[model samples]
Target chain A: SNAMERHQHLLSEYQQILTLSEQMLVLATEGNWDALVDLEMTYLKAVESTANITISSCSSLMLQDLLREKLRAILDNEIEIKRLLQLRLDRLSDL
Target chain B: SNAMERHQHLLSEYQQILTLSEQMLVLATEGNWDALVDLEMTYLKAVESTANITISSCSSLMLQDLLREKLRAILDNEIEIKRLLQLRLDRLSDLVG
Candidate 1:
């Protein structure tokens, strides 16, 4: 029961990270740099929370896979958001 | 022979991309934003060059894997460089606020 609850909380936290990343992506896409930066720090905190999840089972392995699936999407968001950020860098460089 | 030469070129180009990304990472770390942007554009050109390489064989597939290995490294550089850039953004945000 504790394990399931722990994992559920882990998954929930990762979902928050994913959601934050998506919102950050949209912010970057829309050129909302201020809001994006505001979210990025807290968003990174959500990601940092997962690094300590001790592998304390098949169930654990499966949950990790599910977690990674979310991670993969987050990675995609990171790539695009970074690209958009670079675009802004280039734009400002022209000034 | 042509295929081998072509794949070699493809791999060579990807190496250039990786090299450029690594350099950009350094520039970002040093706060050399100007140079980083300069390299970023040319670096992306190297990436664009690889897209035209038609899968024109087992040999081709293997080369693609080798290319992806370089890509994985470039991706890491991208992450770090962007993180550094975000730190700059935050620094600027604090300055003018």
Candidate 2:
């Protein structure tokens, strides 16, 4: 039964991660990294934990591997939110 | 054929922007800034489009460009989750690997 699932659970987990990363990027770009950082960082936990499990149980290839790759990708996005914050500061300097 | 080889897709394109970012760094460090920035920004739409393949194509290189080379650590780890999620927090802290 588990195998029959064809890794649907992992597939869903991966989808959820992708969704979260994309949403955070929107927030970061909108200059809402502060309002969004909380959520963004929280999302990272979900990704890292899921990635570890997938790596341990499954092949470090295919979707599982991609999942891990993206997990860090999204984190990088959040961390880079400093750009948005800096933009805000740059604008303040003009004022 | 397209469906067979998965590239460790990872999380919801949203969750692992950090992951994308890491690879972006590796590439940039090797003097691939052009590509890195592309992926960095692509993440912006990828997040907005929610994986809309056409719109979210920030690709790997673009993501690195978003770094901006600016320094402001406003993106602190969530305090609320620090304790509830301490275990997970531990691994992500200042990890070089």
Candidate 3:
């Protein structure tokens, strides 16, 4: 397919990543720790697939920018959550 | 021994639970979900053991209170992590569909 086609496809995949991140947040809140971890593997695979997409000059810059923004947000959220998890673990060492 | 002794014993178990929980967080951060689940079972057993301890009239309420508070925090952390995990999963259905 063309660059535009690839861009659209990539955008769609990015959407999947975003949606899964939201779902993970819900499960995490519900205390389904085991299920959450299982789901994360699936999410990781989907996110990893995006790396294989080859961007051509025909690709829409605006769409690419949007995808980057969404990815940044998701990564930021992951970082925050990981930080909190670490803090929780550190508290245990004090016990 | 006596209520005091049992309380101390229970407190020690609670400490184990907290320690295991911390270990879980480290594993989770590393994306070692399988190992985290395995560690959780051990943590669960420790927490369950605490429930079997008998609190007598002579037991120290302050220690009991501390244990409960620590448990609550640990549980809160678990909930938060689970929510993040679920969010990660839902993003996939859009593809599978």
Candidate 4:
């Protein structure tokens, strides 16, 4: 079965997260702790929301690979952005 | 009911993950790609295992809050560690462009 809808839905959510993370980096770099936390809360909810998504099956290996690649890219961006935020936290703590 | 056992187990897992991520940060800083990926796979496995843990009704709200706080700290560390790794990947790819 084609799971194109599920694939697009997940991709869009990930993209939204990436966009928010870009803003998060700015907030963090500029020392906007309050706003950063607010954004982080939103990010957390989005992360948690993924639990509800059910990708039961996919018929095409090509489609699966494509979706996987896109997710990898999104996850890469998230990881980089999170590292920067943690660095900021570490600095703030003087660690 | 006391979920202390479950609480401790979850906390322990998270703490282990936190330590692994600290090592991960150093690996990224030192440009140890092979070791870093190896560690990341381990981390992924740990994270997946968390899905299997069952935390039944906790005893106290205070205890629940404490566990939640610990999880927050761990998640914060993970996010940061991932971000750093991504930055390294970006730099590594820059040479190819």
Every candidate's DockQ is 0.01, 0.02, 0.01, 0.01
Better of 2 and 3 by TM-score: 2
Give per-residue lDDT, candidate 3, residue A58.
Answer: 11
TM-scores, each model vs. reference: 0.31, 0.30, 0.30, 0.29
Q: What is the Å distance of residue B50 in model 1 from its true position? A: 55
Better of 3 and 4 by DockQ: 4
Candidate 3 ranges with C-alpha deviation above 4 Å: A1-95, B54-97
Worst 10 contiguous positions by lDDT, candidate 1 chain A: A52-61
- Model 4 misplaced stretches (Cα beyond 4 Å): A1-95, B54-97
- In angstroms, give how far residue B37 of model 2 lies from its true place: 65
- Model 4 residue A51 CA deviation in Å: 26
Q: Over the stretch B6-25, how does candidate 4's per-residue lDDT look in tens digits?
A: 46767887987888889989
**Ordered list by lDDT, greatest first:** 1, 3, 4, 2
List all candidate RMSDs to the true structure.
25.5, 23.6, 30.5, 24.5
Model 2 lDDT per residue over B3-94, tens place: 23223342445466666767877986897755655675454444433333221222232342242211111122232343345445455654
Over the true interface residues, superposed, what is the Cα RMSD of model 2? Answer: 11.3
Q: Model 3: C-alpha RMSD to truth?
A: 30.5
Please give the distance, in angstroms, between residue B71's alpha carbon in candidate 3 and its true position after superposition: 15
